[PDB]
Design an enzyme around this catalytic site. Sequence first.
Site, mmCIF file in Angstrom:
data_model
loop_
_atom_site.group_PDB
_atom_site.id
_atom_site.type_symbol
_atom_site.label_atom_id
_atom_site.label_comp_id
_atom_site.label_asym_id
_atom_site.label_seq_id
_atom_site.Cartn_x
_atom_site.Cartn_y
_atom_site.Cartn_z
ATOM 1 N N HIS A 1 0.828 -1.207 0.000
ATOM 2 C CA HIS A 1 0.000 0.000 0.000
ATOM 3 C C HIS A 1 0.866 1.262 0.000
ATOM 4 O O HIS A 1 0.704 2.152 -0.854
ATOM 5 C CB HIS A 1 -0.932 -0.062 1.218
ATOM 6 C CG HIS A 1 -2.042 0.937 1.234
ATOM 7 N ND1 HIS A 1 -1.925 2.148 1.876
ATOM 8 C CD2 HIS A 1 -3.317 0.869 0.789
ATOM 9 C CE1 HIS A 1 -3.072 2.797 1.801
ATOM 10 N NE2 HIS A 1 -3.932 2.047 1.137
ATOM 11 N N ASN B 1 -13.533 5.007 2.195
ATOM 12 C CA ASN B 1 -14.109 4.171 1.151
ATOM 13 C C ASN B 1 -15.459 3.563 1.513
ATOM 14 O O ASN B 1 -15.774 2.473 1.046
ATOM 15 C CB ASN B 1 -13.142 3.044 0.816
ATOM 16 C CG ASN B 1 -12.995 2.082 1.953
ATOM 17 O OD1 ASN B 1 -13.216 2.445 3.107
ATOM 18 N ND2 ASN B 1 -12.657 0.844 1.641
ATOM 19 N N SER C 1 -7.423 6.400 -1.006
ATOM 20 C CA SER C 1 -5.990 6.277 -0.772
ATOM 21 C C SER C 1 -5.159 6.537 -2.019
ATOM 22 O O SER C 1 -4.049 7.058 -1.905
ATOM 23 C CB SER C 1 -5.660 4.863 -0.314
ATOM 24 O OG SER C 1 -5.983 4.672 1.051
#
Length: 279
Positions: free
Chosen positions: A69, A161, A224
């Site tokens: 990530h 989200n 993100s």
Amino acid sequence: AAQTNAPWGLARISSTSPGTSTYYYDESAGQGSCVYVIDTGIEASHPEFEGRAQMVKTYYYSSRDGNGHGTHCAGTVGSRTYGVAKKTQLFGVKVLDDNGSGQYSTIIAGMDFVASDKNNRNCPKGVVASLSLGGGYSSSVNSAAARLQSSGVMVAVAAGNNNADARNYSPASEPSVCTVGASDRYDRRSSFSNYGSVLDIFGPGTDILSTWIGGSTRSISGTSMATPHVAGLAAYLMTLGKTTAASACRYIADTANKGDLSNIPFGTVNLLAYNNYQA
Ligand SMILES: [Ca+2]
């Protein structure tokens, strides 16, 4: 400068229109700025980073990104192919373990870490921080974002989200920082983008090609992935001289593509990050 057949989101934030694949930008490209990616870490050995990325902190037993990530987000900021600000210095702060989980108190620790550390780094064009993370409202998490921002670091946070008003999420709801939603390549708000009057700006966040660990790439999706478009853009604008760390979220909104997203509820900004470089 022009970079043909670019990932769609870099072409978008250099365009008025959707459906183009070249990224246009002034060649300075964030030289002399610093962006802190506060996340799972950064695989700095990825040639895409060319020597410009360093881990500088961890709160876990290794500073490596063992998740992917942080490396993806950092690549959108500043990798040579996939990045906005292709000459910025990157700094990693591993507040998330390898599954993507961080407690708030360590997140907080990371954040105050950047307000201090910037003073160990050479960033004459400006400092940014990119937080592609969050969890439920916390005054404390929010306070640590206001401090980081107040300390003269442009702070960029994921709106979240859940397809929910973001005022219930942290650090998104904090006012004084720059809360980023997401879009897709057809200019639809992304189906998972939180929304709500605490957003400042939208960026590309659905099917975002970027770096991944092992030396690799993938496309993933989220607020993100949208967040590090705005962080890298702010680094790019500092370096040029258009704005400052404390003024950049206002400058980006002032210079955004205005009206152009579907799926923006009433009461949420309809603003899309733009570099104004080609027109
Ligand atoms: Ca703001």
